[PDB]
Amino acid sequence: GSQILCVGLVVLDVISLVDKYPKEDSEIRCLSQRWQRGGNASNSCTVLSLLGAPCAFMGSMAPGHVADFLVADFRRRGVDVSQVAWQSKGDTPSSCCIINNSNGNRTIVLHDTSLPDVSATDFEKVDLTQFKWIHIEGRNASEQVKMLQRIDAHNTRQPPEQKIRVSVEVEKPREELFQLFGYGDVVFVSKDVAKHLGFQSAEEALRGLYGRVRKGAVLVCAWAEEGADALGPDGKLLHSDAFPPPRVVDTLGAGDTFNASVIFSLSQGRSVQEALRFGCQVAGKKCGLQGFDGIV
């Protein structure tokens, strides 16, 4: 019961730092370039390791030079990679990220290689005893529901102090993913998902979606520079203002920084209010830096 497991994507982010966002049909020169290990669950693993949490990553990779870069980067961070679902078909996903140096805006052109996703059969072969917390990035919902049903079955057979805490992230406005609201002790819903469901604020989103979560769950919604809100079974709306840096330089992975920090703070026994504040604090600190170094 020592590690935090993150199930989701690992993507090579090919980043270009620009003075201004390029206009269509133009040729602009970038200021600088870097390769960064990306993906939601993968970025959250980076943040958890930097916060001092033992953590593991579970996701699909294909053998090759890009996987080697990613594996060496995970290993450099102290991220346990023993649970990686190695594939025999498809390439590892990669993406072109354009980071605007004047405001930190990040634009992503993702290349989805259509690598097979982590399955419920892959998850069944995992020894759950070493994990205190399991975070699932919503992707292949029907297959992930079976993974969540397996964690529930395990917890059923465990004393309350040995129960694995669960968090779920619904970040894409995909109908298939909305069944994941009913799973996990902590549900993270993105601003994009909230707006696509017609909600104009985090408070509207939380009140409008709480009926979809399981009994006792906490629903969390970060609204970028407007801060973040949480709603638990007591019906009390919790809010944290954002911690914007004076100069926002790189927002790529800000949401993942927030998720990992909320998870970390809750796993340390801190209140939902404290975890919300800590999440914004670390997300804000990150927005003032290129990448994840120096967040702690």
Ligand X SMILES: C[C@H]1[C@H](O)CN1c1nc(N2C[C@@H]3[C@@H](CO)[C@@H]3C2)cc(C(F)(F)F)c1C#N
**Residues found near a copy of itself in the complex (CB under 8 A):** 14, 16, 18, 21-35, 65-66, 68-69, 91, 94, 96, 98, 100, 105-114, 251
The reply to whether 175 sits in an annotated binding site is no
In 183-273 the beta strands, taken as DSSP E runs, fall at 186-189, 218-222, 228-231, 237-240
By beta-carbon proximity to a copy of itself, the closer residue of 96 and 296 is 96
Separation CA 55–CA 44 (nearest Å)? 10
248 binds ligand X (CB under 6 A): yes
By beta-carbon proximity to ligand X, the closer residue of 124 and 226 is 226
Q: Cβ of 267: how many Cβ atoms within 10 Å?
A: 18
The reply to whether 8 sits in an annotated binding site is no
287 binds ligand X (CB under 6 A): yes
Q: Cβ of 33: how many Cβ atoms within 10 Å?
A: 9
Paired tokens of 247:
């100069």
By beta-carbon proximity to ligand X, the closer residue of 19 and 192 is 192
By beta-carbon proximity to ligand X, the closer residue of 227 and 232 is 227
Alpha-carbon separation of residue 135 from 46, 90, 123, 132, 241 (angstroms):
14, 25, 13, 10, 24
189 binds ligand X (CB under 6 A): no
By beta-carbon proximity to a copy of itself, the closer residue of 70 and 136 is 70
244 binds ligand X (CB under 6 A): yes
199 binds ligand X (CB under 6 A): no
By beta-carbon proximity to ligand X, the closer residue of 12 and 228 is 228
Residue carrying structure tokens 């709480």: 210
225 binds ligand X (CB under 6 A): yes
Q: Indicate which single residue of 131, 199, 243, 292 sits in contact with ligand X (rule: CB under 6 A).
A: 243
Which one-letter amino acid corresponds to residue 188? F
Separation CA 218–CA 216 (nearest Å)? 7
| Contact assessment for residue 169 and residue 40, using Cβ atoms and an 8 Å cutoff | yes
222 makes contact, choosing from a copy of itself, ligand X, none, with CB < 5 to 8 Å by partner type, with: ligand X
Helix (H) / strand (E) element for 100: namely strand 94-100
186 binds ligand X (CB under 6 A): no
110 binds ligand X (CB under 6 A): no
168 binds ligand X (CB under 6 A): no
194 binds ligand X (CB under 6 A): no
The reply to whether 250 sits in an annotated binding site is no
Separation CA 15–CA 107 (nearest Å)? 10
| Contact assessment for residue 133 and residue 263, using Cβ atoms and an 8 Å cutoff | yes
The total number of residues written for the chain in this structure: 296
Count how many Cα atoms sit within 13 Å of the Cα of residue 40 in the half-sphere of its side chain: 18
By beta-carbon proximity to a copy of itself, the closer residue of 23 and 125 is 23
| Contact assessment for residue 61 and residue 84, using Cβ atoms and an 8 Å cutoff | yes
The reply to whether 38 sits in an annotated binding site is no
Pick from 145, 151, 152: nearest CA to 181: 145
CB of 256 to ligand X, least distance (A): 7
138 binds ligand X (CB under 6 A): no
The reply to whether 73 sits in an annotated binding site is no
The reply to whether 204 sits in an annotated binding site is no
- Interface residues with ligand X (CB under 6 A) are 106, 222-225, 227-228, 242-245, 248, 251-252, 254-255, 258, 280, 283-284, 287
Residues making up the annotated binding site for beta-D-fructose are 13, 39-40, 43, 256
